[PDB]
C-alpha cells in the first residue's frame, strides 16, 4: 500500500528530526563566543590574469599550489602559472559552454565539461607536446556541473540529470551512479580522504555519498533554495554550502545537522562559490553582489571583503598550501589574493 | 629571468597572440540561443540553414552566426539559462498549429521573457508551421476559440497589412497568436528587450535573413544605449 509507505516515510522523517534535535545540546555560536575574533582581513590583489575572452565559470588549483586551470565560455582552458602569470597552456575545447574544470591531483590531466553533457579529460604531459583529449566521458541526460579527480583514473561528475557518477577514465565507463537527488546537482566536494563526497543540488539539499559503497549516507536539508556551491571542511568532518538564498551553512557529518549559518542583511544575492582556508577558520564565498566575503567559520562574523571584480564572482578556490585565494568572475579576469603582511 | 623563464614568457606571449586572434573572431560572431518544444520545428529551421548542445553555424552577408540548440537537458531550465545572459538574441520557435500545446508554449515564452538573467536579451519569435495553421483553420475541424475563448471577439487589426493571397480567416488566426505572444512581450520590460514575431514554414528559405535583420536591430539598439544617444 503506497499510502502506508508514504506515511512510514513521514514517520521516519520525524524520527530523523527528533534525533537531530536530541543531539542539539548546544550551538556553535554559544560554544565559540569566547574565541578571539579573526579581525579585519585585508587581502590584496596580488595577481590579475587577463587571458580569457569571455566569462570565467570554474577554476581549480593544482596540488603544487602554483598552477591554475581556468574555464571560460569561449571554449578555452588556460593553465596559468600563478607566480609569474604566464600562460602554460591554452586548450581549445570542442564545446564552448563549459561550466566546470578540474585539475588532476597529479597534474597530468585536466577535466572539463558543461552543456555538452561530456566530461573531457585532457592529457597535459604528452610526448607530442600538445594537450590532447585523453578521453570523453558521456552519459548524462543533463549538463555537467562539477567534476573532481579522485586520482588519475577516477573522476566524479555531477549533472543536471539529478545524478552524480564515478567514472573509470581508462575504460570510460561509470563505475557507480549516485541517484538520490531530485534537482540538478550543482557542486561536488571530495573529502580529504577521498572516501566520501558531498553534492549540493537545486533541491535545497546536500547529500553525503560513500564513493566506494555507492549509497547516500546522509542528507542535509537546511537551505531554502538551490545549493550552488559546496566545500568540505579541511578535516572531513564538516562541509560548507552556499545557496541562491544569500545564506551559507556549515554542516557537521557527525552531528548530522547545521552548526552555523552565515547571513547578513546587506546581502540579497546568491552564493556562487564557497571554499575554506587551510585551517578552516575562514569561509570564503562569492556572491553575485559582485564582491567576495570572508566569514569567520566559528564566530559567523563577516571578517572581510574582496571587492575587485566588475561582474559576479563565479569561482573561488583556496590554494592547497593556503597561501592564496583565486577568484574568477564573468568579467573574464582571475584575481589572486593573499594576506596583507 | 633565467633562460627558461624567458622562453616560458615567449610561449605565454604566443598564447596571448592566439587569444587575441580568436578574440577578434569571437567578438565578430553573433551568438544565438534556439529554444522551443519538440512540437516546434527547430530541427527543420536548422536543416534549412555533445548530445546536450548543438552548435549550428551559418553566415549571412559575411556576418557569422552561432546558433546553440540545447538538446538532451532536463526541462528545469532555471539553471543553465544563466550561461546565455550574454547572447545577441533568443530564437524562440513555437508550433502555430493550434492545440493545447500552444498555451504551454505561451507559458514557456513567459518564463524565458521574465527570467532575471535574460532581462536584456531580445527574443526572435518564430511562429513556425504556418502552412499547417492555414490548412487547419481552413478545414475548421478544430478551431482556436475552443482553447483560447477570446478569439470569438478578436477582429483583425486594420494596421496589420495582410499578406497577398491569404484568406482573412487565416490572417485573423495567425494575428491572434502573434498578439497573444506580443502581449506577454509588452507586459514587462522597460524596453530593454523587444520581441520580433515572424511567421515561417518548413519550406521558408528566408529565415537566416530574418535573423540577420533582427540582430541588426538588436545591435543597433545596444549601440544607441551604449553610446548614450538614447
Amino acid at each position, epitope marked *: 500500500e503506497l499510502d502506508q509507505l508514504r506515511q512510514e516515510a513521514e514517520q521516519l522523517k520525524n524520527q530523523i528530526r527528533d534525533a537531530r534535535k536530541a543531539c542539539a545540546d548546544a550551538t556553535l555560536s554559544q560554544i565559540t563566543n569566547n574565541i578571539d575574533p579573526v579581525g579585519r582581513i585585508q587581502m590584496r590583489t596580488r595577481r590579475t590574469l587577463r587571458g580569457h575572452l569571455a566569462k570565467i565559470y570554474a577554476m581549480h588549483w593544482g596540488t603544487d599550489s602554483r598552477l591554475l586551470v581556468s574555464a571560460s565560455q569561449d571554449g578555452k582552458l588556460i593553465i596559468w602559472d600563478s607566480y609569474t602569470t604566464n600562460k602554460v597552456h591554452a586548450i581549445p575545447l570542442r564545446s564552448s559552454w563549459v561550466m566546470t574544470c578540474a585539475y588532476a591531483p597529479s597534474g597530468n590531466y585536466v577535466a572539463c565539461g558543461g552543456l555538452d553533457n561530456i566530461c573531457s579529460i585532457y592529457n597535459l604531459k604528452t610526448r607530442e607536446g600538445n594537450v590532447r583529449v585523453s578521453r570523453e566521458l558521456a552519459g548524462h541526460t543533463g549538463y555537467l556541473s562539477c567534476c573532481r579527480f579522485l586520482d588519475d583514473n577516477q573522476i566524479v561528475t555531477s549533472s543536471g540529470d539529478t545524478t552524480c557518477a564515478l567514472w573509470d577514465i581508462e575504460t570510460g565507463q561509470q563505475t557507480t551512479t549516485f541517484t538520490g537527488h531530485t534537482g540538478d546537482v550543482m557542486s561536488l566536494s571530495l573529502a580529504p580522504d577521498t572516501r566520501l563526497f558531498v553534492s549540493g543540488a537545486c533541491d535545497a539539499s546536500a547529500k553525503l555519498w560513500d564513493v566506494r559503497e555507492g549509497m547516500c549516507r546522509q542528507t542535509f536539508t537546511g537551505h531554502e533554495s538551490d545549493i550552488n556551491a559546496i566545500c568540505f571542511f579541511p578535516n572531513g568532518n564538516a562541509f560548507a554550502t552556499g545557496s541562491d538564498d544569500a545564506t551559507c551553512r556549515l554542516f557537521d557529518l557527525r552531528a548530522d545537522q547545521e552548526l552555523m549559518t552565515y547571513s547578513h542583511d546587506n546581502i540579497i544575492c546568491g552564493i556562487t562559490s564557497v571554499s575554506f582556508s587551510k585551517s578552516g577558520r575562514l569561509l570564503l564565498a562569492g556572491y553575485d553582489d559582485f564582491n567576495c566575503n570572508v566569514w569567520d567559520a566559528l564566530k559567523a562574523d563577516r571578517a572581510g571583503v574582496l571587492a575587485g571584480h566588475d561582474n559576479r564572482v563565479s569561482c573561488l578556490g583556496v590554494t592547497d598550501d593556503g597561501m592564496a585565494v583565486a577568484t574568477g568572475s564573468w568579467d573574464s579576469f582571475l584575481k589572486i589574493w593573499n594576506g596583507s603582511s | 629571468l633565467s633562460a627558461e623563464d624567458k*622562453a*616560458a614568457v615567449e*610561449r605565454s606571449k604566443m598564447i596571448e597572440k592566439q587569444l587575441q586572434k580568436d578574440k577578434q573572431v569571437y567578438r565578430r560572431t553573433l551568438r544565438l540561443l534556439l529554444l522551443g518544444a519538440d512540437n516546434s520545428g527547430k530541427s527543420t529551421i536548422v536543416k534549412q540553414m555533445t548530445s546536450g548542445i548543438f552548435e549550428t553555424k551559418f553566415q549571412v552577408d559575411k556576418v557569422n552566426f552561432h546558433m546553440f540548440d540545447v538538446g538532451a537537458q532536463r526541462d528545469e531550465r532555471r539553471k543553465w539559462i544563466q550561461c546565455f545572459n550574454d547572447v545577441t538574441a533568443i530564437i524562440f520557435v513555437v508550433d502555430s498549429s493550434d492545440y493545447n500545446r500552444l498555451q504551454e508554449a505561451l507559458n514557456d515564452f513567459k518564463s524565458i521573457w521574465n527570467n532575471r538573467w535574460l532581462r536584456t536579451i531580445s527574443v526572435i519569435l518564430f511562429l513556425n508551421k504556418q502552412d499547417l495553421l492555414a490548412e487547419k483553420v481552413l478545414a475548421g475541424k478544430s478551431k482556436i476559440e475552443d482553447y483560447f475563448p477570446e478569439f470569438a471577439r478578436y477582429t483583425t487589426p486594420e494596421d496589420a497589412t495582410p499578406e497577398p493571397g491569404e484568406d482573412p480567416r487565416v490572417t485573423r488566426a495567425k494575428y491572434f497568436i502573434r498578439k497573444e505572444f506580443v502581449d506577454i512581450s509588452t507586459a514587462s520590460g522597460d524596453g530593454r528587450h523587444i520581441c520580433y514575431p515572424h511567421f515561417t514554414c518548413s519550406v521558408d528559405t528566408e529565415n537566416a535573413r530574418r535573423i540577420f535583420n533582427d540582430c541588426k536591430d538588436i545591435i543597433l539598439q545596444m549601440n544607441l544605449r551604449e553610446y548614450n544617444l538614447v
Partner: single-chain antibody, 232 residues
Framework: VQLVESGGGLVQPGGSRKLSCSASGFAFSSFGMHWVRQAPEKGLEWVAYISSGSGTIYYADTVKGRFTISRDDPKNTLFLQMTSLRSEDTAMYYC??????????????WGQGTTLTVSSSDIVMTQATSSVPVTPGESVSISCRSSKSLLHSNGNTYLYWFLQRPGQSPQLLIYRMSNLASGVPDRFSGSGSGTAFTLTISRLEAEDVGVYYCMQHLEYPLTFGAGTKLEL
C-alpha cells in the same frame, strides 16, 4: 616522434652547406629547437637556438654570423645554413627538441644526427673525471662543478644530465637536478649544492654504459661538460 637530419657529407673549407631536420610525430610548431654538435671523439657543443614562432635566436660565439638557423613550421623542417665552414666545424650535428614552461623538460629529444666533414663569460662546466670503471649492480656517482652558481633566485637549479650510448644520440636523464625525465626512477637520481652537482646510479646495468654529459641552462651560451665515460 622522430627528428631525422639531412645534409652533411664532405665539404671543402670555406664552402657552404645546408643541414635540415624533419620533425614528425610531435607539434613541431610549439617546440623550440637546438643544434648541438659533437666533434669526433670529443664532447658535445652548443651551436644555435630558434624558439617557437622564431621569436628568439641565439648562436654560439664560435658560430655567430657564420651559420644561420631557420625553421619552416608548416613543413616541419628545421634548417641550419653554414656560410664559411672550417676544419673546427667537423662534427655530428644533432637536432634537439626543447619546450619551455613550468615543469617542462627541455632537451628531451635528440635526432640521430648528420655527419659533416670539412676537408670568457661562458659558464665553464668541469666533470671530475673522464672515465670511471664499473660493473653491473654497483652504485655509481658522476659529478660536475660549474664555474657559476646555477641556483637561480627562482629556486630552480638549471643543470641537465645526458647519457650518450655508443652509436646513439644523447638521452636526457635528469633535466633539473632531482627531476627525472626518461628515468628508471629506482636507479637514476641527482642532487647538488648549486655549484657542485652529482648524478647517482643506484644499481648499474649494461644499458647504462655510455658518456654522461652535464649541461647548464642558465645563460644562453649553453656549455656542456667534457663527459664521463662509464666502462664495464
Amino acid at each position: 616522434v622522430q627528428l631525422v637530419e639531412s645534409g652533411g657529407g664532405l665539404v671543402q673549407p670555406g664552402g657552404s652547406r645546408k643541414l635540415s631536420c624533419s620533425a614528425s610525430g610531435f607539434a613541431f610548431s610549439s617546440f623550440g629547437m637546438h643544434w648541438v654538435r659533437q666533434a669526433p671523439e670529443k664532447g658535445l657543443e652548443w651551436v644555435a637556438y630558434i624558439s617557437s614562432g622564431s621569436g628568439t635566436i641565439y648562436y654560439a660565439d664560435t658560430v655567430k654570423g657564420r651559420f644561420t638557423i631557420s625553421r619552416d613550421d608548416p613543413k616541419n623542417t628545421l634548417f641550419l645554413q653554414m656560410t664559411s665552414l672550417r676544419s673546427e666545424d667537423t662534427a655530428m650535428y644533432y637536432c634537439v627538441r626543447s619546450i619551455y614552461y613550468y615543469g617542462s623538460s627541455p632537451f628531451d629529444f635528440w635526432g640521430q644526427g648528420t655527419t659533416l666533414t670539412v676537408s670568457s663569460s661562458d659558464i665553464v662546466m668541469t666533470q671530475a673525471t673522464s672515465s670511471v670503471p664499473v660493473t653491473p649492480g654497483e652504485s655509481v656517482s658522476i659529478s660536475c662543478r660549474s664555474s657559476k652558481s646555477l641556483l637561480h633566485s627562482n629556486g630552480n637549479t638549471y643543470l641537465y644530465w645526458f647519457l650518450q650510448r655508443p652509436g646513439q644520440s644523447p638521452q636526457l636523464l635528469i633535466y633539473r637536478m632531482s627531476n627525472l625525465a626518461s628515468g628508471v626512477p629506482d636507479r637514476f637520481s641527482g642532487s647538488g649544492s648549486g655549484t657542485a652537482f652529482t648524478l647517482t646510479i643506484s644499481r648499474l646495468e649494461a644499458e647504462d654504459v655510455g658518456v654522461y654529459y652535464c649541461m647548464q641552462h642558465l645563460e644562453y651560451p649553453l656549455t656542456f661538460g667534457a663527459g664521463t665515460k662509464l666502462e664495464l
